[model samples]
Target: MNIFEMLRIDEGLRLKIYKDTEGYYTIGIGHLLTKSPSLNAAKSELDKAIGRNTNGVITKDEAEKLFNQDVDAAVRGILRNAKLKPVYDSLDAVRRAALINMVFQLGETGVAGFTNSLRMLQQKRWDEAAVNLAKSRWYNQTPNRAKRVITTFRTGTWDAYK
Candidate 1:
């Protein structure tokens, strides 16, 4: 599956506001509304996207569109990191998706903090990279998702999606 599809599954869809694992107000496909400039601004944007000012509900198409936009931002976030660009370019599609998935969940700076893991990935030390990822508090925060991403890094395959 593509990164979008994989993320849709990993992040799950929500048509209404909900508290994420980290207790942030999230909407659509893992869109952290709490991160917006203001809760009012976020809700206004969601209303614009859904073409309505209803409570919190959004259509599937609207959610998908927002998801795509978020994914694009995640990709750009990865590319913006000069230290990460070359490592990202050297990977195959699946591994690249893994990194994008990471960037989607943890902001670019969050993932960038994994200096050892990124170095292992850059050197193509798949097992070492996976192990390094597992060593992080991120793993404890979202064990299943982190495991999937780590496996993707280790195997360079879509097995995690399955």
Candidate 2:
């Protein structure tokens, strides 16, 4: 299942579909959000911002109104180029689950802020990439959670998928 399905999003996050004054279907929360949202748009934006804002760090409400399209494009671009996509796409369901949580904790910018991680990923050095992944601000910031996720990523287990 996709992240949305996994998260079991209900009315709280369903597209707030509406009609504009011109009678066009509109789904935007507002300018404050990342984009004039549709489902895909929200996922594109929210997935990139997942973990760093726990406790509803960056709420869907915020996502709907303030995030704006430009930010979403840029965030996804960084996610794509930084090898985050590969790391993400390569994951199994359990690992992917934990990773979704991790990605949120480390926003694309926070992850990309790792100069060495990006460099090694660009070079396609697998072991080094793993090291870079481990030696993240994530570890420095959230050590306990980092330990388990690192183990999961390294062992190819979904142990940390929570």
Candidate 3:
């Protein structure tokens, strides 16, 4: 599966504003509006993107557009990390998506903090990488999602759908 499809399942979708597990203002498919320069600017962008004032609610189409944009940003952010670039390029599509999925959930800096995991991934040690991921706070916070992502890394296959 492609990154977009994988993310759609893993992130899920929401039309109305709500607090994420971290209590940030989020909408669409895990789009963190709190990360924007300002909530007003974020809403303005969303409104303009859909050509209507969302008033804290977005259509599925609008949500999809935001999801695409967010995914693009996540992909670019991951590629910009020098340490991850080579490991990212060395992986197959499924493994690449696995990395991108983690970036989407944790942000580039958060994912970059996985030094040992990245080292294992760079050596193509899938089991070691998976173990490193399982040992994290992220795994404890979101066990199901982390399990799926870890499995993707371990088996180099799409686990988001499963």
lDDT for each candidate structure:
0.86, 0.48, 0.85
Model 2, residue 40: displacement in angstroms? 31
Task: Give candidate 2's error at residue 145 in angstroms.
Answer: 0.8
Worst 10 residues of 3 by lDDT: 34-43
Q: What are the TM-scores, per candidate, against the unseen true structure?
A: 0.91, 0.40, 0.88
The ten-residue window of minimal lDDT in model 1 covers 33-42
- 1-162: candidate 1 lDDT, tens digit per residue: 999999999999998877788877688899887755466766776677667894677778878888999999989988989767877998999999999998999998888889988899999999988888899899998999999989999999988789
lDDT of 2 by residue, 58-150 (tens): 456544443344334433654575456665555466555545544444556566466675455445464665677776566776576677655
The best candidate by TM-score is 1
Q: What is the lDDT ranking, best to worst?
A: 1, 3, 2
Best by lDDT: 1
Candidate 3 lDDT, tens digit per residue, 46-120? 676668888889888888988888888888997899977887998988899999999999989999889999989
Q: Count the backbone clashes (under 3 Å) in each candidate.
A: 0, 17, 0
Which model, 1 or 3, shows the larger TM-score?
Answer: 1
Q: Which candidate do you rate higher for lDDT, 1 or 3? A: 1
